[PDB]
From a paper:
DepB plays a critical role in this process by reducing 3-keto-DON, an intermediate in the epimerization process, to 3-epi-DON. DepBRleg from Rhizobium leguminosarum is a member of the new aldo–keto reductase family, AKR18, and it has the unusual ability to utilize both NADH and NADPH as coenzymes, albeit with a 40-fold higher catalytic efficiency with NADPH compared to NADH. DepB belongs to the aldo–keto reductase (AKR) family of enzymes. Here we present the crystal structure of DepB from Rhizobium leguminosarum (herein designated as DepBRleg).
Four protomers of DepBRleg are present in the asymmetric unit designated as chains A, B, C, and D. Overall, the three-dimensional structure of each protomer adopts the classic triose-phosphate isomerase (TIM) barrel fold (α/β)8, except that the presence of Pro-204 in the region that would otherwise form strand β7 disrupts the hydrogen bonding pattern leaving this region as an extended loop. Two auxiliary helices designated as H1 and H2 are found at the periphery of the barrel, while the N-terminal end of the barrel is capped by an N-terminal β-hairpin loop. A pair of protomers (A and C, B and D) associate together forming a dimer with an average interface area of 2362.9 Å2, stabilized by 24 hydrogen bonds and 13 salt bridges. Dimerization involves 3D domain swapping with the exchange of the α-helix of loop C which interacts with loop A on the associating protomer. These dimers interact around the crystallographic four-fold symmetry axis to form a D4 symmetric octamer, with key interactions mediated by the N-terminal β-hairpin, α3, α4, and the β4α4 loop. The absolute molecular weight of DepBRleg was determined experimentally by SEC-MALS to be 325.6 ± 12.1 kDa which is consistent with the 317.5 kDa predicted for a DepBRleg octamer. Although NADP+ was present at 400 µM during the crystallization of DepBRleg, there was no electron density corresponding to this coenzyme. Loop B in the apo-structures of DepBRleg and Polaromonas sp. AKR is disordered, but clear electron densities for this region were observed for the NADP+ binary complexes of the other structural homologs. A water molecule occupies the position equivalent to the carbonyl oxygen group of the substrate and forms hydrogen bonds (2.6–2.9 Å) to the side chains of both His-122 and Tyr-5349. Overall, DepBRleg’s substrate-binding pocket is slightly larger and more hydrophobic in comparison with the NADP+- cortisone bound complex of AKR6A2.
Residue numbers in the entry:
A (entry chain C), C (entry chain C), E (entry chain C): -2 to 218, 246 to 342
B (entry chain A), D (entry chain A), F (entry chain A): -2 to 217, 242 to 342
Write the structure that this text describes.
């Protein structure tokens, strides 16, 4: 078990290639089950926890919050990432990236998580009603006061990434570190330009739902899908491992991947998913999955046509 | 009689809602042909000329320059826009958005056009081999020296636009004015996010190929083929309904889309130029515009650009999910 | 009752189109009456409260301060706006926008209001004795420490708005959000350029005294006035609603209006004023009120002459 | 013998308290007439010439330029100021404060005046179609290249002045020097806040039409008409009292108002130019100045510009309301 | 008694034209006597107190500190100014404007003065061993945290003033407000350029020792001196007031004077000194004192020669 | 043989420790006289020429320019410095540090000197009528266009130097290099604080009149008169002791003071120029330098510049008062 350690984007913080998602904490998995999953994850060696204030209306944060207090040794190794943006209630200002809400949402997450500082505070989604300048200034005030260590994004598009990244740079704020996109063999549309936007900013990716909610595990059950699902099945049975470990090993080796967020619900699935770190796909199989699941946009501007138009051969010429 | 004027993006320059493309000058249209087109365009009231150094290896610029020399009255109205980026020769540096190449490309464009200042200088496409900071500095140097008035982009994607825009602000440079994208009823993918990027930066659109190279006029993988014909059928159905050209319906739709500054026409004959310019007098009804919008709507995966990802990022002003 | 929600200027915070003014709290309406008015306003759905430290020498703030503590659920929805600038005593430094006074005035309002942070802190009037740079730096320190969320202005003129707005922009401070002008059908002189100055800055308007202190309600009782009052009366009786609801519906639909500050004193007047949100004037009546109450300045520079001189026809020519 | 010199706003340039307006050159006054006026003005000791590209479609500038060519000694003393903004032609871009138009307007002004540097280049009026950032950048480019020395505004209101001023500071550009407003005993509305905006920015005033186009000299809704005549009656009463022209009283009052850099005279004959310049030797008494100030005081609504709004914003240095 | 109120330099804070110096508190005047003087000064209407941490090794601050706590009403009107720079002990770092010492000295003054914030914190003297950038950054951190309201200088020369003023401007810090120079009819050398340097920066002057330690009161007892002393005596007896009130009235009317720091030790002298505010010298007497006490430097560069060389006649010419 | 070279303040330009002043060229010394002096100076190895537009109404510059034209070899070594500020004419703007006047003063200096770039352009004196920001911007414009290399001041006091210096840093302009003060054994008041201001800004001193206009060589209120003669007596006593000129002792002292970049000689004849340049080979002893320093020490009041105010601001590195 030689750990797969990666940098939290451009920062000096290190995380394990696999991250524990707590979306099920307090929903399909109660406090007891959730406590078990955290114990197993850290027993394996992972140090990355991702939650959100809206995950069961704070029950997820509250569960994590007291597991951290009950096991202090692992608490001092864990990188905690939560989010804020979506409705913590039905009030007009119980929502968004406004200074008004983020102020209350950050204090609420800190409270329910039981921490003096949150390692990674992620905007759960773009908020067109709030100028990005306002959101960034609040985050910068939180960095200086110490409430947060770093910040990242989720549900941001290409020009979202670049605009925020460049404004923070111009205003002397800290650089953003990550983006949390829904990503897997059935959803690769972020590759059209969103990935490139992160790479330009030196940001890392925290892909969530690497199993497509279970569609890539094989259990489930419309043309492309089954061609893709069938490929994962042909390789897993060829290599003698689960479908999940295939799709997971594929996600882990994609460009700009900082850590994969697992959403496993049971100890068995967590032990199976984590076992993918020792699965080394072949370049021939990796190319096979890359092809059968390659996004097929229009030629312009993200398709083959627009890419060749923008390409510049170093030797010159058409 | 009633001309549709629009601001050149965020600047104080005004251009007619239709722009004369010159891709054919020196190729399919010789000097006399090109000069007749220019004459007809300015007799219509237009004031916007778009060319590029690579159109027929600089002959488009040379033809336009001789015409300007020969028409002092129109030349005083003309807003002249050209481009640089693609190869003017087979050398490793006859190309790119580098300081080395643009200084020579801009100078050659000025000489071929016979101008001391180009109104709108456009990067023909992104160049991942040149830092955007290097390109922007050069352009800022060209503004202060008076060689160019404004600058814009073509073949830039979402983060390209926001990055260059925000860096210009940070450096104190002038803001870019326009994006010249390939955009028509058959190709609306710049709406996934690129248009919004332009709107955030205050830039206007200079769409080109508004007729899909004759496909939206009449010259007759599964999902794409079906949409093309559903579009072609709607256009001619609305065209026959209103008793106008199919090209005029397509152009009226394009000129009515969000953020459109001027539609670049690619007419090769006086006859089709007149017809296309007649699109300005065609006011599509509410139902017609909606019918064309729905039948030609892009259909990406739900995440991130599809309906799902959109509703996720949306924030109701009243609150609640 | 479909709420009329608007943005607090350029910010990400949302407020109801109508705002409760507490000028009478502790004056014509004691703590009991004032408590009643707050209960009704929030029962209707409003979330915007405007007070000031000098409103009865803090009695207004103190009343609001304990209504907030007594009804915690509404307290967590309310956007609180107070002011500072005018004399809280007769000392030479018990007044102004100086760092010396604002420091004490902000802590005093926070104390009497019982809040950790004030949502909107408004300068009650321009202070020529204090450089705007000093005032803005203090406000920026308050934003960073969290004592305030946003800030706005009151009794500022056109070049006041632009100077402060542009200095904050150049110095990296947060942008101002609002202006609180005395505005109504009998006082539209802010339209000469003050409104345009706010629109250029993306700032919203919090008009107070939309009834002219009661002159537009019809009760009261010199040429223009009665022509204007008569117009409001001809429309209200034509539509079958009160004079107040007419003038209020007019104020709500004027350019750059974020929220109208009601100064009602009794439950009846508050219920009548708030009923104007469902009153949709006609374009013909809206034009009728716009004309009979149009400000008539000299031709130059704010009159018709100066406006046509500065106009630029997009097609060119004289 | 004793000349009244004043700084050109905040700059280190000095100009006489009276400036020769040239609106009539090439219209009511032909070349010879204009040249006599210029001669008489500089023989008086003046050094300030104000014109504009739009005065008689550039002929005012051409007349002034030929005169400067013909009077090398005076030309070395002349501070030359002109303008751009209003249409020099019927094209959509023969107008505005855009980079596109000002680059051509400034060049044409330099050519018509026969100068390599214009001392004071003025925006004739606000242009809501052009970002003030775009205009200010162009002007800053003109300062570094030496085409202009200073810049100023005309027909700007309160927030216009403060915005452009503060943005110049933020960008590191040179500060604007002057505002040229229409200002006289009959029109004092720039005192509602515009004057204060100018004082905050350190700018001086170049009032024009100081005689109300002959109304303040003698050429014979309710509240306005009454004030006009109460003013006209006071002027001639003080004029007959001191035994001087009505024009001289009006001018002496104007030149004594706050922030006044130089009063732009609009004289058409040598006789009336001499009389107007004689206003410099007229020192109105304390009572006379107060009587003129009160009878011509603006009277807006109490809020925001009236007495009420003023007392509200006032802060007693001792404290208390 | 119409108060002579002036602005604390460029700031929005106002102070009385006369300021109480506490140099004798704890030295020639014990805690009792010092308490009396503070009571009289505020009874007259003054609001300005100047002390220093080294005034009797903190005894001065400690005396003021508990008079403020014992009379809370005057405490809420008083503008408190203290200093730091000189040795609070014999340690190598018990001295200077270094971040190391000022940190401890500011906390010590706050402690002994019993205040949450000091209104005017003045550098007691230039410190060539500490870069002015270091001193200014510390002060700016103190402004933001609220420990101080404003800052000023003492024993700074012309290029000291300009360098600090312009660096703070360039770095976005707050502008300095005052300079505390030893100034009077026998010491006017700051007029050579130091005054002009303050005026360029919009800074006000807090002259201390306006009586020359008692030489201008007449009690004391070498050519210029007695000519100057004799002039003050000829005018005082001509006007029927004390010598002190003459010299004080002269100091109060000099260019750029914000407030005069009185160093009176007894109630009688304080009542006599303060009585000078109602003494209005004549322009003929003011010119008489200005001439007989005019500094006589060399022609170059501060003398008449250097001034005429640098002069520019607005009409041009030599 | 052994030349004393020193940096031109903080810059990378090198100048000989003695600089040829040209105040007399075109006045007491005609063209031939001036040309002989220049020849002798450069034959000695000097490379530093200081003039000013006001020296004989531009004739000093014209004489120097003709000489440079006639001596290509020396002209390639010459560091040429001139000035602008004082009146070149009786007009209200033939003077000052304004953009209006300096643009014309710098151009006229370049023309009279026959140069495309002046090495060191100096403000002859402070100008309280022109914002220092306006002057500094103009100078920065002249650096980028190549008209001047470096800039410096003359007749600036303590806060003048620190203010302009710090504003240049803030604006990103080039740093000023030198101050040219009147400084000699008889006039040391720039030591009260001005020298320290220069040292803080890294500027060097270009003292002029190092002989007190002949008083420190021999041409024969209470406290001042006494010091002058105590100084004159010490100089000739050290001069007779070492068997050298009185002028050489005075110059050796001046060139040995702190922050001295180059001493500007004001010689009118070849004989006295040779003698003065011989001061470079005179190395005053420790005792001699101390004796001259003490007898010529300034004596202001104790506060702020006297001994008292100095000891007050001093900080012992060990601590304690």
């Amino acid at each position: 078990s030689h750990m797969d350690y990666r940098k939290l984007g451009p920062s000096g913080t290190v995380v394990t290639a696999y991250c524990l998602g707590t979306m099920t904490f307090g929903a399909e998995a109660d406090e007891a089950a959730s406590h078990k999953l955290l114990d197993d994850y850290f027993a394996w060696g992972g140090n990355f926890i991702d939650t959100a204030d809206v995950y069961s209306a704070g029950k997820s944060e509250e569960i994590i919050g007291r597991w951290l207090k009950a096991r202090p040794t692992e608490a001092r190794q864990a990188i905690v990432a939560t989010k804020g943006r979506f409705p913590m209630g039905n009030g007009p200002n119980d929502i968004g990236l406004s200074r008004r809400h983020l102020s209350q949402a950050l204090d609420d997450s800190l409270r329910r998580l039981g921490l003096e500082q949150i390692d990674l505070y992620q905007m759960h989604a773009w908020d067109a009603l709030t100028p990005i300048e306002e959101t960034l200034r609040f985050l910068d005030d939180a960095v200086s006061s110490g409430k947060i260590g770093y910040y990242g994004f989720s549900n941001y598009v290409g020009w979202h990434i670049a605009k925020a990244s460049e404004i923070a740079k111009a205003r002397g704020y800290t650089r953003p570190v990550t983006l949390q996109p829904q990503y897997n063999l059935l959803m690769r549309d972020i590759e059209l330009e969103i990935v490139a936007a992160c790479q330009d900013a030196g940001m890392g990716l925290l892909p969530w739902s690497p199993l497509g909610g279970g569609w890539l595990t094989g259990k489930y059950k419309q043309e492309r899908t089954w061609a893709i699902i069938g490929t994962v099945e042909e390789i897993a049975k060829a290599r003698g491992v689960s479908m999940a470990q295939v799709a997971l090993a594929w996600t882990a080796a994609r460009p700009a991947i900082t850590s994969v967020i697992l959403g496993a619900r049971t100890p068995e699935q967590l032990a199976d998913n984590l076992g993918a770190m020792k699965v080394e796909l072949s370049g021939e199989e990796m190319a096979r999955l890359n092809e059968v699941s390659a996004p097929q946009p229009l030629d312009y501007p993200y398709g083959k046509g627009g890419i060749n138009q923008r390409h510049r051969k170093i030797e010159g010429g058409r």
